[PDB]
Each structure stands twice: as structure tokens, then as C-alpha cells.
Design a binder for this molecule. Sequence first.
Ligand SMILES: CC(C)n1ccnc1C(=O)O
Ligand SMILES: [Zn+2]
Ligand SMILES: [Zn+2]
Ligand SMILES: [Zn+2]
Length: 231
Amino acid sequence: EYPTVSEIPVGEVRLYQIADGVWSHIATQSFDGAVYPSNGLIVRDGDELLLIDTAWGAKNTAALLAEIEKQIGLPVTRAVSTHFHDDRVGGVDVLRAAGVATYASPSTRRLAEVEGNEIPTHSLEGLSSSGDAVRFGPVELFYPGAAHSTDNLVVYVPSASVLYGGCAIYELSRTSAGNVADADLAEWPTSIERIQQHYPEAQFVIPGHGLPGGLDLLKHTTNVVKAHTNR
Ligand SMILES: CC(C)n1ccnc1C(=O)O
Ligand SMILES: [Zn+2]
Ligand SMILES: [Zn+2]
Ligand SMILES: [Zn+2]
């Protein structure tokens, strides 16, 4: 079964095999006296690995690399951060020190710099307009439009029909909006609809935080965001 906070002490990282050659990584972080789980993705690319997002912080990300080497034993050669917040770029310095080539859109790199966060080395072209998609090794990167943040990307694994939504997609247990300080509430439902239109065949949907589900998570997120809009 999918791990929860009570199964993961902060500092430790779990891997969960979603499908052949596709894992999520799960870590925990404390924020304001509460503990949050956070998901990222690992995708096999031949005899290498592609990492999607850090494990939210330097210590967690170092533990992530150690757990990957222990359990999978293939090199993480590239990493993609799906937006500029700390749970996604926090640990980029650890990845870079370990020899991982780090990537983000130029929109993400700029916003991370303004926030004083860690900055991925490389810039991903072809993702500047809503609906843009590019292949990056074994995944497709998709910019659906502004949602949780103006730069948020989602990631699809075509071989496994796995959609990783990052923080633009909420788990079913989340009934109210999370951090929306940098969100475009007005555009978020339209952006989610672009995801649905582009990946209608998705079989596994991974939210940024919490339990995987199916495409139901998209309309659930839209409902939560619209209700917050009308608060
Ligand atoms: C739920 C809040 C506090 N959060 C923490 C990290 N990421 C988020 C988010 O909403 O995306
Ligand atoms: Zn965020
Ligand atoms: Zn987040
Ligand atoms: Zn719901």
C-alpha cells in the first residue's frame, strides 16, 4: 500500500513502484507544526534514471539519492523541477553536487531566483505557452497554464500511462486549498481542463502531495479551487 506520513520519519524517503520502470518517491516535511508528505517521480530511461522533483530539502534529497542507489542501483543522470517552490527545487544543490544535471523551464528558473531558492542549471525550451508539450527522455513535459503557480509543469509517462500532476493536482483527501499565494485561481480550472484534454488515457494520477488516484483527481481539484475562489 502507498506510504503515509506515519510510516515515514522526516529525513527518510520511500519509493513506491507505480508501474514498470516508474516509481514515486515520498518524503515528509514539517511546516508550521504539521507534517506533510510530498511526492516526486522516478522514471527509468534505458540504464539511467530521470528524477522528477527533489524530496523537499537538502537532507531529504540526499536520502532520496541514497535510497535510489540502494533499491534501484541505476544512476540519476537528469532531474526536472516542476515549479519554483522549495518542495520542488529545494535540494537542487545536492543533486548538482552529486553529478545530476538539473533542469527547469526558464519561467521556473527566474521565479526561483526571485524567491532566493535553488536554481536548476539547465533551461527547458518549448514550454512557455499553455498547452505546450515536449519530450524529455522517457516522459512528456506539459505546461497546462498557470494553476498552483504560473510556471507549474506536469509530467506524463507514455509507456506506463502515469500522469504526475505536481502541486497543480490535489489528492482526494485534501478538501480545501493549500498554499495558493502564488496561484492563478482564475486560470487553474482552465489549466486542469487542458491536462484532461491532453492525457485522457491516463491510468495513474500522482498528486504533488498524498495518495495517487485516477483522473478523478482533476475534477476534484477544480471543485476545491472553485470553492476557494467563491470563499
Ligand atoms: C500544503 C502546502 C502547505 N504545501 C506545502 C508544500 N507544498 C504545498 C502545496 O500546497 O503545494
Ligand atoms: Zn508550490
Ligand atoms: Zn507543494
Ligand atoms: Zn472532491
